[PDB]
Amino acid sequence: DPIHDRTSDYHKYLKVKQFKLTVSDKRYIWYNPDPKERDSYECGEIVSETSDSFTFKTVDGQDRQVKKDDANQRNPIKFDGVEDMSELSYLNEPAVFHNLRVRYNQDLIYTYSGLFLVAVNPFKRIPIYTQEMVDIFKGRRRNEVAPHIFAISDVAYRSMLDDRQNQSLLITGESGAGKTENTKKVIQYLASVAGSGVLEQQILQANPILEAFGNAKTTRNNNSSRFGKFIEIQFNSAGFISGASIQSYLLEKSRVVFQSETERNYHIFYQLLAGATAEEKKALHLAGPESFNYLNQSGCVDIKGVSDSEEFKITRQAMDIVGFSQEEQMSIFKIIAGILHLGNIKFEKGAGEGAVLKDKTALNAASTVFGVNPSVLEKALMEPRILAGRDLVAQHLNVEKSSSSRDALVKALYGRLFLWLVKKINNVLCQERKAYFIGVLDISGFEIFKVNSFEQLCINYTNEKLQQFFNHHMFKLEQEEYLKEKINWTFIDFGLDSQATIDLIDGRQPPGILALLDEQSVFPNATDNTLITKLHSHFSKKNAKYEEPRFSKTEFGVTHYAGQVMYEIQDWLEKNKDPLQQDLELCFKDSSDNVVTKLFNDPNIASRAKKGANFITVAAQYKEQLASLMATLETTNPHFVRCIIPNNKQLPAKLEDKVVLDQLRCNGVLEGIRITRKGFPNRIIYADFVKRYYLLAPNVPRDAEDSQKATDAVLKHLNIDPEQYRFGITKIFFRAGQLARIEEAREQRISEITRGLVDQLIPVINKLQDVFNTLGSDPLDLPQIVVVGSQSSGKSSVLENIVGRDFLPRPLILQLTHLPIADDGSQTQEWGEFLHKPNDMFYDFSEIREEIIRDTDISAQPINLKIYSPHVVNLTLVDLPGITDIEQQIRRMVMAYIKKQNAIIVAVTPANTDLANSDALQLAKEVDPEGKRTIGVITKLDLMDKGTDAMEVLTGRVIPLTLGFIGVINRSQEDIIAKKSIRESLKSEILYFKNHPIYKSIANRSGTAYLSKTLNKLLMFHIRDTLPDLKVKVSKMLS
Ligand SMILES: Nc1nc2c(ncn2[C@@H]2O[C@H](COP(=O)(O)OP(=O)(O)O)[C@@H](O)[C@H]2O)c(=O)[nH]1
Ligand SMILES: Nc1ncnc2c1ncn2[C@@H]1O[C@H](COP(=O)(O)OP(=O)(O)O)[C@@H](O)[C@H]1O
Ligand SMILES: OC[C@H]1O[C@@H](O)[C@H](O)[C@@H](O)[C@@H]1O
């Protein structure tokens, strides 16, 4: 499997490369060293914080202060390059840009952002689109695979199948940002997983055809789409591709007759001149691009890295696959050549005012390939006839009017031809009956240029609808989540904010811009000036979205979602009417070419108003085409892809802060994860919340059975304001920022209990023991000393001797802390504390012996007792109940502790029960064969016999142990009677060993004092020894 294999291309091209921050308490923030250059950020370290402000170190070294509201906190470096950014604590501009930057530098162009897929144009070839790549994403969910256009394509496909619902992928972005390359990938993927195959190939081959006739080199993209498109991939009930349909929008017809410097005309013109055979060149009267006015004005006839000749062969091959006949292909080329020839017709002034045509070469070449009469064409261009009552009189046009008519004819022919290709492709691919479909929208985003005309208003009007569509979708998703989880919160319809701009544009009852343009377009003697005047007269100061400029008399402003746009009214009347002289329509209707004739005969192509209609303007036509696209999208489950251009130079590895940040602000990516930040943006299943924050609260198992109760426990302990959250049916919900704060607590907490893992080793292990080993088990396998012994052996006694004061009558965790002589030279009073009794202090050891008998209502849950005394050494012990009914469980409980390799065993056994067939010592020999972590404690050395001695074990020769043996004698039952305090017993024990016929030689290595010192030492070094290993565990448990 490629997904797991590190040495796989999948990990090499789609996966990010590969305890540090664990102990660290450092927190950084993004800031711009220059308050003017808001796009340039630097990372600063935080060193101070009030109740609503931050203080941090600047790269220069100076300290700065910023309020926690305007603060752009930085996410932990561990989260750099996260597949999905929606899972980040902070989503400010710099944090978002940083995550993309990190990924982009590793050639990872795809990243998620909520219901958004972000794709940053690499402007370079990246091997992640091969068949093998496609096979890897098949079936996978958007979680088990890295971000990729294939991933959302599969999710859409699976969704269509599983929900029996149509889907749509809206791929938008600035010119050259990558919309078309991604659109093709989606089609590529679909044809592969649901598709080799005649139909499949035809669907794929329709693209080169449309790009040839609809794409061109612009200053921003060598392969710019000069039309928008919606592609429907149709499937049958079984999920197999059954067809496809294509709709085209806003083809830039003016490009055919005029291109700005360095740009080109549509690819097909250069493809035809370079790739036509010698026979085709002759028949079509071709020549080099420089010989044609429509291709020799911009200064550019070729594109670097592009072979127009090779592209022509590909285009021709595609037409064969799709099914265009040979004759049809020739007719198409004749139309392209004919247009070129029309562009070469040079009108000049005649004897009078009317234009004349001196040279007929171009006119005749055109007439020949078009299959129309030259004499008729010439008269239709310079002497078109107009209706004058019950008669028909000719109108001799001057040069300017003649030239414009020729151009209008060129644009109509190209536009019609283009619609014809699309129709022919649809006839071959579309299937009137399909069970479901996945639609892909590849169209330009908002266009805000220096000069914006009628075309820009159309594309911007389209983007107001698309943006409104996305906002409403987000609203519905949010509302559906809140309802499902029964969270009482209601938002104001997000899509409502853009209704005013839309109405200002396409509003009917209250006359909108388009309605006024249409009214004015049919007005008797209307002009662009009367048009702009009507607009100002209707919206100036009357509509908040409209603006009459201070000086310009030919422009008006519209506040669009992406900002204000100024539109020039010039030629709008003419663009909305798109006139063509009737005599030119007649001339071509009499063409001898089958295709030319259809361009003028087919109503669905030749006229905007089909059979029966009265009259329709271009604006009204597009309003309807757009309304129909929206209605189709509204029957689908939408998926969104946001393409970003890295810079404005079409260069690889060159991500520019300003250019990228600008897109993220009007693209919707930033605004998106900002519109929901008013309710409860963050929501976590109770189990997952507990599994992560159980640490911030005591008595909360990482896997509590009642996840909801545990969650409440944590929230209360942290003193979280109940208004900042809500308890859903399966998840806890949080207001914006609340989850981030809790996460910060988790980070700080973790740092305060692991920093000590760098003497004071015992207190550190103690903290970890209180945080984890409290529930009952030993997760981290902490370095500890476990005391075990048989019934009536002397455990309680010795423990009491170590404590130096009686306090004993489930596992017992005794954490002793030595209290140093007070600074006053005085001796602090000894007291005890329990973990289950947070604020209680037991200065009276009497109620401690009782409190133990209290809480003991056998269990595996340990009782955490801490004792601070100036009479004890620093030491922690785990006292386990003495050893076939319930003891059967005890043996397992014991074995559970002494099994751990990080545990030291203190075997307690009396000296009046020999060694032959002992108990504890043998029980330890099971889990510790070599006896390298077991220390024996011999008691009752005074209750042996007449001459019975035990120096044979104390010297380590009977039952040898690495840690050896230590002898001790505690109070007898009769000693417990009356006074006889532990201290007095101790004073007695010393004399016993000091003045003993045999033990006197090892006196110094005997006694409670010696035992305490030794246990402290063993524990101190054992922790030191386990320190390395334990740090590996801790780090893994917190991740
Ligand atoms: N004379 C004497 N009695 C002892 C000694 N150690 C324990 N005992 C007595 O043995 C009994 C049980 O001891 P204890 O420490 O409660 O044993 P445990 O069952 O392991 O808790 C008590 O009556 C103690 O006074 C010792 O060294 N000498
Ligand atoms: N993912 C990609 N891999 C390689 N080149 C790409 C990629 N996306 C975009 N490009 C490059 O960017 C150019 C412009 O992309 P394009 O999809 O045509 O932009 P848009 O359609 O948004 O105007 C491409 O023709 C190509 O050189
Ligand atoms: O004018 C009535 C309606 O016509 C539709 O075509 C537009 O898409 C709507 O936005 C508009 O409200």
Ligand SMILES: [Mg+2]
């Ligand atoms: Mg494109």
Ligand SMILES: [Mg+2]
């Ligand atoms: Mg005991």
